[PDB]
Amino acid sequence: SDTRYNKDFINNKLLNEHAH
């Protein structure tokens, strides 16, 4: 996960739960 695999580097956050 700490090697560039934490949700596309917190881009794919899911927009942050589909943008909160």
List the Cα angle 13/17/20 in 5-degree steps.
Answer: 110
Q: How far apart are CA 1 and CA 18, in angstroms?
A: 22
Instruction: Please write down the long-range contacts of 9-12, taking CB distance under 8 Å and 24 or more positions apart.
Output: none
Whole-number Å distance between alpha carbons of 20 and 4? 24
**Is residue 13 within 8 Å of residue 6, measured between CB atoms?**
no
Residue 12, SS3 per DSSP: coil
Method: NMR
Q: What secondary structure letter does DSSP report for 4?
A: T
10: left (phi over 0), alpha (psi -120 to 50) or beta: left
